[PDB]
């Protein structure tokens, strides 16, 4: 033994092309708000008001037009550009100076879910050091990072396994201490040309300082047509009040 | 006794705010395409390739970034700016010179439907003069222009009646001859400050040269959250081929 | 024996890179106005209010943000996209339907000059048919289309000659009848991959219906750093009044 | 007794309207580069590579399109939005967390000058604490912050005096320690509704830790038509090499 927020809103959006030809996936509707508003509200609800937003050079104009300084939402934004869609871990690496010695909650912009994050953030704040991942039991684990759980302990995490050990998806909501940046520096682009967040989670795991919690409500990614539509249906009654209009 | 296309894609998008804070309603997803692609494909399918697009000054950049010259879609686009959301009839008025002496099919950008328009365009091409409107029986006629039909004849059309005479909504797909422009010049902003398309339809009706057809498949507007979501669900399997990606 | 205006504002702007990385050359300052305002004012001063603007897909947003419907300037704009910088003649070809059977004044967006165009437009309006070009004696004719004048008659025009026959540059202000479009259809990309405006001027010349006038005041292109700076210096006291701000 | 860079590129640009209707003053040409490139190169030349850029919400898209992550220029950018043109001091206040305990060089985006800043940064790095301002003798001191110098000591600085005590303009290049932020918190909007940088400079002065240097080459603001044109002429031969294109 001071909590920062990070929303990763980069990527090409190729899977959703052409609805992402001009826009940027995280500015597409999810319910009555642009997708990215959900991540902002999740952090705000936990009193995490210092938030860094990462996106592509081309997309930054539109993202900033929506989010501004953050004053209208009761938060405070800082922006950085990710040159190429080189990976989640690469995007997170740009936030090193912003986080400093504090802890952070990282939310992948296309992850939409019902749980409040506060209970998890509070537990993590009571955790001496390390990281925490949030799990969701899913029907199609092959699409995600998958946690191999034995006797209530994570043995290993595997990214998009052809033969999943379980149905526990490691969601895109990560809680980290500042040590993550020193490890991000020991680079390895995977078979698909990316710095993998699963490698980071396994590093903390091997160090014996990774904890996890199973989420209670619904969760979905919004990066495919079917899952984007699902997120929209699930999000119908979500209301953020007059600050978010 | 030469058919032009017109897509009206203006308006404020206030009903959908904030998902329309930056974008423009007609560039929001409807299925796997931006809403406006549907109108373009409807016209293209009828071999109507000379198309004028009307939108706001602020929105034109994004609309043009999606649509371009029209070459990628096998069509040809021309653009004009509507300064203020002064009405459908006002927007149509900007297309006078573009249409010249030809006939036209006007599609409100937020009208999504399954019918091919060709059968209606072919009938209209065989109509000596006048106009044609396409009707849909709906559950909530109070939201639309409503046709009072007696003995298979339209007696009058009424815009958003408090007490609808019928459930026949006059959809936002209009077929007109070039005489519409001379009448648009005899202006009257309604109680809400707009030049009403219903007034134009009634002018043709009183002249005895308005025809109608009842549509066969589904139809929906996409200007409210619930109706936008409905259009998305209805549009899931719509495929425009590789030209539209 | 009805005069339309055309401003060609396309091209890559590569010569001015990087000041044209984001913007678009014709929106760069020339005096106290964006470059394109000069062309608009020239046409407006001649009571030519129906004006078509041609530019690239990417640049259209910014061009339209400046120009709008044209109402603020007392004119009326219509826009079309030129997919690639395939040439002046190609850009002009997109204006066929807009012009119809009328005559037109074409102004290359980067041509800045002091003369009023009215005297030339009035003469042309009294010309049975054909075209008219406006000439400027220059120090560096090798950069431009060059008119070979003998006994007060144009013998031929040559595009960027290595050995100029004269110092008479054929400026980027062209007056044409509607026959230009039928000829633009008989395509020939030059040695540099473009449809050449000089070929069009020579076609009218061989038909014996091309006239010319020598301009009286200053003129400059604004497509190079040095010439853009020159145009700025020359333009210091140009005032368009409160409509142009 | 670690040097950060700050470029303030906000403001309305009203003085330059309409050439700033769409763009943003700091993206207008100054020589063969956008105005803001000059400030970036000044900092880079001094090995100041961690740079924060402040601008308006609307302008951020274009600024980021030019600057990106900073990788192409050998620097590293972080961006924040200034909601309203509430003043230089207000804009600087947004950089508190970014600077932390380090020192900083602040450059007003519209200040163009020939001197290298290194000699001044090196002296400041050898200064126990405080601030440093750079002075230019000018013909029209009434337009600027003016230093009252007696016996080689600054007695006081006065913002845009009606009756200047001297012709020493306090330029828009400021060198500060991290204490500036604690003072920015003791707010006072001046007679024109702004937090004044001159008040900050006087605070350091009264504390006896403000130093100054007279600049050796040319300097100009670029916020008026005449001064923007002057900056352009002065900047003609400035070359930043292939990284800046
Ligand atoms: C590749 C990349 C992504 N991101 C952002 C954009 C998206 O909102 C978000 C998701 O990136 P994707 O490439 O779709 O990641 P995806 O394949 O869905 O898998 C990730 O997200 C899954 C949960 O959705 C996890 O289970 C996986 O362990 C994790 O690797 O992260 C960036 O900000 N920059 C990037 O370069
Ligand atoms: C007001 C206005 C609208 N339009 C475009 C934008 C929208 O895609 C489309 C619909 O405009 P709205 O104002 O929503 O019209 P709405 O109230 O839905 O009613 C219209 O559309 C209905 C069908 O959707 C018809 O039944 C009504 O007779 C007709 O008046 O027209 C413009 O291009 N410019 C405009 O100023
Ligand atoms: C190539 C091209 C150009 N244009 C527009 C953009 C510029 O404002 C303008 C000039 O194009 P440039 O390619 O620079 O043309 P340039 O080499 O200067 O020469 C032209 O302009 C000269 C006068 O400036 C004439 O003397 C030449 O006969 C004529 O060919 O036309 C387009 O709208 N589309 C295009 O594809
Ligand atoms: C008002 C304001 C300005 N700035 C940026 C935009 C401009 O590039 C730059 C200059 O702001 P201006 O309002 O023009 O400041 P100006 O009246 O020129 O005077 C300042 O700059 C002068 C030097 O140019 C100094 O001598 C004065 O002491 C100083 O107050 O600072 C912002 O980033 N945010 C702002 O709210």
UniProtKB/TrEMBL annotation, chains A, B, C, D:
Gene3D superfamilies (alphabetical): Spore Coat Polysaccharide Biosynthesis Protein SpsA, Chain A
EC code: 2.7.7.24
InterPro entries (alphabetical): G1P_thy_trans_s, NTP_transferase_dom, Nucleotide-diphossugar_trans
Domain Nucleotidyl transferase: 4-234
Short name of any one Pfam family annotated for the protein: NTP_transferase
Tagged with keyword Transferase: yes
Leading EC class: transferase
Keyword terms, alphabetized: Magnesium, Metal-binding, Nucleotidyltransferase, Transferase
Gene Ontology molecular function terms on file: glucose-1-phosphate thymidylyltransferase activity; metal ion binding
Name by which UniProt lists this protein: Glucose-1-phosphate thymidylyltransferase
Organism listed in the record: Bacillus anthracis
UniProt lineage: Bacteria, Bacillati, Bacillota, Bacilli, Bacillales
